[PDB]
Design an enzyme around this catalytic site. Sequence first.
Site, PDB file in Angstrom:
ATOM      1  N   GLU A  34       0.869  -1.169   0.000  1.00  0.00           N
ATOM      2  CA  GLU A  34       0.000   0.000   0.000  1.00  0.00           C
ATOM      3  C   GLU A  34       0.903   1.215   0.000  1.00  0.00           C
ATOM      4  O   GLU A  34       1.415   1.617   1.027  1.00  0.00           O
ATOM      5  CB  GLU A  34      -0.880  -0.034   1.218  1.00  0.00           C
ATOM      6  CG  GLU A  34      -2.153  -0.729   0.965  1.00  0.00           C
ATOM      7  CD  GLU A  34      -2.673  -1.473   2.152  1.00  0.00           C
ATOM      8  OE1 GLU A  34      -3.043  -0.842   3.181  1.00  0.00           O
ATOM      9  OE2 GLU A  34      -2.734  -2.710   2.026  1.00  0.00           O
ATOM     10  N   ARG A  49       2.476  -7.449   0.850  1.00  0.00           N
ATOM     11  CA  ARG A  49       1.549  -7.196   1.972  1.00  0.00           C
ATOM     12  C   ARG A  49       2.182  -7.463   3.351  1.00  0.00           C
ATOM     13  O   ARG A  49       2.168  -6.597   4.195  1.00  0.00           O
ATOM     14  CB  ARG A  49       0.250  -7.981   1.814  1.00  0.00           C
ATOM     15  CG  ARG A  49      -0.700  -7.779   2.959  1.00  0.00           C
ATOM     16  CD  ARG A  49      -2.054  -8.274   2.622  1.00  0.00           C
ATOM     17  NE  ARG A  49      -3.083  -8.089   3.654  1.00  0.00           N
ATOM     18  CZ  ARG A  49      -3.885  -7.023   3.728  1.00  0.00           C
ATOM     19  NH1 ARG A  49      -3.741  -6.023   2.866  1.00  0.00           N
ATOM     20  NH2 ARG A  49      -4.822  -6.949   4.671  1.00  0.00           N
ATOM     21  N   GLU A  72      -7.966   5.200   5.176  1.00  0.00           N
ATOM     22  CA  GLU A  72      -7.917   4.339   4.021  1.00  0.00           C
ATOM     23  C   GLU A  72      -8.427   5.087   2.812  1.00  0.00           C
ATOM     24  O   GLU A  72      -9.456   5.724   2.859  1.00  0.00           O
ATOM     25  CB  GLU A  72      -8.769   3.110   4.272  1.00  0.00           C
ATOM     26  CG  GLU A  72      -8.463   2.006   3.289  1.00  0.00           C
ATOM     27  CD  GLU A  72      -8.541   0.635   3.910  1.00  0.00           C
ATOM     28  OE1 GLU A  72      -9.040   0.523   5.046  1.00  0.00           O
ATOM     29  OE2 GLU A  72      -8.103  -0.334   3.261  1.00  0.00           O
ATOM     30  N   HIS A 120      -3.498   3.516   4.955  1.00  0.00           N
ATOM     31  CA  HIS A 120      -3.783   2.329   4.141  1.00  0.00           C
ATOM     32  C   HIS A 120      -4.448   2.651   2.783  1.00  0.00           C
ATOM     33  O   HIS A 120      -5.184   3.639   2.649  1.00  0.00           O
ATOM     34  CB  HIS A 120      -4.715   1.361   4.883  1.00  0.00           C
ATOM     35  CG  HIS A 120      -4.103   0.681   6.077  1.00  0.00           C
ATOM     36  ND1 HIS A 120      -3.322  -0.453   5.972  1.00  0.00           N
ATOM     37  CD2 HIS A 120      -4.209   0.943   7.404  1.00  0.00           C
ATOM     38  CE1 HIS A 120      -2.969  -0.851   7.182  1.00  0.00           C
ATOM     39  NE2 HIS A 120      -3.489  -0.017   8.065  1.00  0.00           N
TER      40      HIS A 120
HETATM   41 ZN   LIG Z   1      -3.644  -2.055   4.470  1.00  0.00          ZN
END
Ligand SMILES: [Zn+2]
Lengths: 302, 302
Positions: free
Chosen positions: A16, A55, A170, A108
């Site tokens: 991310e 990730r 996010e 995120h």
């Molecule tokens: Zn994330």
Amino acid sequence: EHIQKVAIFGGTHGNELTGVFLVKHWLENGAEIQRTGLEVKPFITNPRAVKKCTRYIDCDLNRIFDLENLGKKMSEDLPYEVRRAQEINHLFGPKDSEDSYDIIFDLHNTTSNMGCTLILEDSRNNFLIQMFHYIKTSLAPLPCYVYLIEHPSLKYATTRSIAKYPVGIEVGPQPQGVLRADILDQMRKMIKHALDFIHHFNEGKEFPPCAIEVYKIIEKVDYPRDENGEIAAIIHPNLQDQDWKPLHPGDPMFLTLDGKTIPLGGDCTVYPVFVNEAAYYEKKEAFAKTTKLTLNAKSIRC
Amino acid sequence: EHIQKVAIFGGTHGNELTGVFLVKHWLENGAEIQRTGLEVKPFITNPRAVKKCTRYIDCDLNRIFDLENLGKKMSEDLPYEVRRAQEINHLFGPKDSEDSYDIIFDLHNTTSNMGCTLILEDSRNNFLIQMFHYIKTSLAPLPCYVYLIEHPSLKYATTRSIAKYPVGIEVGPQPQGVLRADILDQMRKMIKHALDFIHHFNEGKEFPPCAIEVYKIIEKVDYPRDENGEIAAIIHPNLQDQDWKPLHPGDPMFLTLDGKTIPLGGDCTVYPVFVNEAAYYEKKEAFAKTTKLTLNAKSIRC
Ligand SMILES: [Zn+2]
Ligand SMILES: [Zn+2]
């Protein structure tokens, strides 16, 4: 009461990239994230996963900040992220101690089309509700949604949950491993406004009661699997990219390769979020079913 | 001359899912890809990368179909994808032999905003040019672009390059590890028309001379790096998602976090392609600069 210690974490998930880019730049010049009489520390939580653009290395960093992991004896054998969670907790916690950081923003990205999203963990939390309201209003006309997680366990294990006031940021849609200018600009703006709020609160500004709309997860909805347990239908084009918008009993939800529509059913309206998120394939999830509700905050004043 | 052996390859990159999904369904029911008097074989090229949902395991399958790898002694110590290339080359090749498959379609996805793309490796290749022209016309008004690779080495190393007539099919934008309905419907339309073409050629239909526009790569353009070699600016919002569209010497190309625009320069028009592709970060590439040119085909008849 006065807010002292603030952190902005990036790279909790190494692929991310918006968070990683911001934090890396801020570590070289923090001017944009400083406020008069406020120290904000940017920090990269998962360096190894960021180098591999992945990730995680051994397990998800954002799922282990709890007594079971943070309390186990430190050892070279332990999964990298467990090892890392204990370091982070020592730097910015200890979680649940009075010494811990006051506010942490954990940045995120999602592949879902969610736009600007704030993630709230305590539903009864006037300070944070007030902040989210301030952010919402500042971004207008840019939309900004609040996602609510309500564990009846009363326990969280997210990286940010170290703080007295954890804040999840996010922004999507963005493919993993990709850095979009527009997405970066949105997240910057959210941070700019969040820090303005903290600063204003510290200056002793009063805040009347307020209300926000939130979306609370009620069910992870899975893809139709077949005899072998394999995905057998995919997110219908009509549902794709329609995160946050109402979905009724009649409406299209899945499409099969043979071309048939699988409709919602149940008998009330729901609000899909995380529609078609890359990270939710393995962890069996097509989207989250949410209810929309209003939270109220009492007035606050430092 | 009569076309017999046709393959459709999926999962060359394990996390480009459109191909994987179609191929797996076709392996259970091939009706949609059969034509009268035409045997078409669907195959999953990279099974382990597909299980781990990952671009590759040890190295890029699409990069090693050449004398240097295909000709090395088979052993258990060889990188997985090398082993696999040999397996593949023996099933559908040997590359360069008269017995090798006639046409292979290798299915692919990009995070770039390219829409339907056909990739051509021989610039002097009447049968292929004629096919691409058919598919373009068929798809219209849906856009469909042809990307031309021209190695002065005369040598290619792609999975599909095993065939006498290699065909690359790429469709974006789609994040890796995600299955979008619209993208799937586009790819399958392209396949439907490609196979119609082959079928019609086999039935002995005449095709007059024709012309297509193609885009030939002239330079991989990298991100500005800083003294430590780290990305220092990002794809400008104006350039983002403008794959195929002309970009002029004045025009914005990169944006810095500090907010300055880095313009194109040089002094002629160019056609950005693969703008902001996930796979091209590591591989140092913001986009490919292309020139637009016209290819002509002589008339063909079975
Ligand atoms: Zn994330
Ligand atoms: Zn690919």
